[PDB]
Amino acid sequence: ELHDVIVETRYGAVRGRSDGTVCVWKGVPFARPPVGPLRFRPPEPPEPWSGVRDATRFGPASVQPEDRLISNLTGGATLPQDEDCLYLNIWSPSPDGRRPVMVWIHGGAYLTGAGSIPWYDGTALAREGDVVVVTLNYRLGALGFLYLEDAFGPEFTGSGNLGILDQIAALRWVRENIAAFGGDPDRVTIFGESAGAGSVGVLLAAPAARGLFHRAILQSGSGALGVRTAASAARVAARVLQHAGVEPGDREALRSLPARAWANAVAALGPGLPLGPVVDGTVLPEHPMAALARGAARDVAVLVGVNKDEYNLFALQDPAWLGDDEAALRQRVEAVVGPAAGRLIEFYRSRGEGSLGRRLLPLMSYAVFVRGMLATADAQARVGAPVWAYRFDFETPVLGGVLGACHALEIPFVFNTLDRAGADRFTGTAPERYAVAQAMHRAWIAFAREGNPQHDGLPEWPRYDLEERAVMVFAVEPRVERDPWRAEREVWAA
């Protein structure tokens, strides 16, 4: 019973599709295309249009490398891509209403991903929760995060945070236009995973983002993840420019270079997280963790968590983690934790069972993910902001169970997109999957609607506090566990 549904935005009318249970608008522009003079420059509001704009099709993704690690396990194709990528997608029960709004920032290391990916489909959230869901694209890679302040001067001030500024523009668009799609502009929750959660953590710090959301969910990511000093960022940028072949100060070459060549130059630097939001002193005045300590988000309610076996995802690329090679493992640990590596290795090697890599995978999970989660939770608890903590323990059985509860596994559970294409390849085909997704899905709904994640499906979920450190565990049997990271937190402090 699918029918076109037209809604009018400040810029113009948009044509979307509805079965009547739910409506969707795809490829709605929240900014003018960041091309030519707008390339490497802050996002600009879209030009108004006459006529009814088609919102039946997704916008192109930002230019990106293949980053096929998830894709090799999944069946996913390369994303259709263009420098003109600034589009958002809206799911709503109805254009009439003032519903709670959930705004999603995708992950992928500030280099890959898109709002258009099917696992981020908002239909189920909207239907079950009576909420409006928004997914968005932001500039990725060099075009989003290249710090050009030193190389090209003040005209490019803020260049390191362009992707963040895109996210802020989308949030501005929502404030202005969400009512037309049945959303409440005053009731907006931002949620992200990985680099998206890192993005959310930055937005809590950023003055430009203030007042644009009231609540935040950070999944497998935090303000600690990926944030760069201006100096570190300028060094990376020099390397990228070298690969690109653009001399510092050469404006014509900068605008002239094709977008794909920017992607290739970043790829040339090699694997890791070389690009990220920058403490530039404007968009980001301070480090996000410093802002949290200061009480910058004391009004904002936070749901924050991690998966039990985060780093195991990386084993798909690098199988040392499934092995017992000490020299190789030491190198990898040392890359992340530098001088502390030796002491921490001794603590983790003693704990657990199996291969050394299996025993060291928690140390990598803690350094990269758990530390940020806990610092976020602790800062909010100290300021007295409402905060809830979770650990997702449901394991995928795929590839002999070696992934466990790996990074990104929670995403279909939160969105209830388990049946969507490629998800089952990641999550396995177990029937217990659906029950776990329901409890998580409904908690995300509940948080956005009332600022409390508790629902009847769950056991009682206490706010996270320094004394008890209560953490909800999503598992076949959901439970609250108190101070689960205690042993680790003490040893890391030692």
Side-chain angles (χ1 to χ4, degrees), residues 149-154 156-241 243-250 252-272 274-345 347-381 383-463:
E149 257 152 81
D150 296 340
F152 282 77
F156 292 92
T157 292
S159 45
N161 289 322
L162 288 177
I164 299 297
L165 288 166
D166 297 346
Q167 299 165 15
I168 291 157
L171 275 170
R172 298 289 301 165
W173 182 98
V174 163
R175 144 176 271 183
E176 286 146 37
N177 299 288
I178 206 56
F181 303 86
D184 196 323
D186 308 2
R187 294 171 78 185
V188 165
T189 297
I190 54 171
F191 69 135
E193 180 266 350
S194 193
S199 299
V200 163
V202 167
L203 294 172
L204 295 169
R210 300 187 93 70
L212 284 166
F213 44 89
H214 294 32
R215 299 193 259 253
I217 307 158
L218 306 82
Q219 311 156 219
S220 306
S222 81
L225 195 98
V227 163
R228 316 198 45 77
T229 73
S232 72
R235 290 183 313 163
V236 168
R239 320 184 207 173
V240 171
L241 283 171
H243 301 300
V246 179
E247 274 304 290
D250 185 358
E252 227 334 274
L254 202 77
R255 294 291 190 339
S256 295
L257 200 76
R260 176 100 277 120
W262 289 111
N264 301 327
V266 180
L269 251 159
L275 288 171
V278 181
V279 192
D280 54 10
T282 49
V283 184
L284 202 47
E286 65 193 318
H287 195 283
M289 297 326 302
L292 269 220
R294 252 161 51 175
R298 65 182 65 208
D299 293 330
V300 177
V302 166
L303 175 57
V304 67
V306 296
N307 302 344
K308 193 182 63 259
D309 316 287
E310 291 269 351
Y311 207 87
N312 295 33
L313 182 62
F314 300 128
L316 301 181
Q317 294 297 84
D318 165 31
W321 295 105
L322 313 169
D324 322 68
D325 180 314
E326 196 142 325
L329 290 172
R330 280 192 169 257
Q331 175 141 47
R332 292 171 180 57
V333 172
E334 170 235 3
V336 172
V337 211
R343 186 163 194 158
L344 290 163
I345 281 174
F347 166 82
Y348 281 96
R349 189 151 160 189
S350 321
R351 301 160 49 104
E353 305 218 81
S355 157
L356 184 66
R358 149 179 265 282
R359 286 178 279 127
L360 266 21
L361 273 159
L363 188 163
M364 302 301 272
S365 291
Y366 191 95
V368 178
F369 297 108
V370 183
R371 289 187 318 185
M373 167 200 177
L374 293 184
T376 299
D378 292 342
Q380 293 300 98
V383 302
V387 54
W388 290 264
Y390 77 82
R391 195 185 69 232
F392 175 73
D393 281 12
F394 193 82
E395 296 195 356
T396 178
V398 171
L399 297 182
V402 300
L403 287 329
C406 56
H407 185 65
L409 191 61
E410 87 285 354
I411 286 172
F413 289 82
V414 159
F415 280 89
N416 204 30
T417 37
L418 283 174
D419 300 321
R420 297 300 178 115
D424 58 279
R425 300 186 104 70
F426 194 31
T427 62
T429 58
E432 295 105 314
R433 329 225 278 337
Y434 304 116
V436 176
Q438 179 151 101
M440 229 183 166
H441 186 72
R442 293 182 154 174
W444 267 231
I445 292 320
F447 183 74
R449 263 219 150 260
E450 314 300 323
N452 193 308
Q454 189 53 33
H455 64 94
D456 90 300
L458 279 184
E460 185 247 336
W461 184 348
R463 283 173 41 150

Side-chain angles (χ1 to χ4, degrees), residues 3 13 21 35 53 55 62 110 113 172 224 237 263 292 301 316 321 363 377 412 415 430 466 488:
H3 42 266
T21 78
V35 296
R53 231 187 142 274
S62 174
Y110 307 107
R172 298 289 301 165
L292 269 220
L316 301 181
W321 295 105
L363 188 163
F415 280 89
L466 292 203
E488 295 172 79

Side-chain angles (χ1 to χ4, degrees), residues 70-122:
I70 187 58
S71 188
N72 302 319
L73 197 53
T74 310
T78 303
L79 301 185
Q81 278 165 45
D82 201 73
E83 180 168 12
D84 168 22
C85 52
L86 298 188
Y87 300 98
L88 47 74
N89 325 290
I90 309 116
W91 287 260
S92 176
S94 152
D96 136 75
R98 254 200 317 294
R99 292 164 194 93
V101 187
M102 307 184 56
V103 179
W104 173 252
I105 318 189
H106 70 79
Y110 307 107
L111 303 165
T112 20
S116 320
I117 301 220
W119 305 2
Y120 307 149
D121 189 84

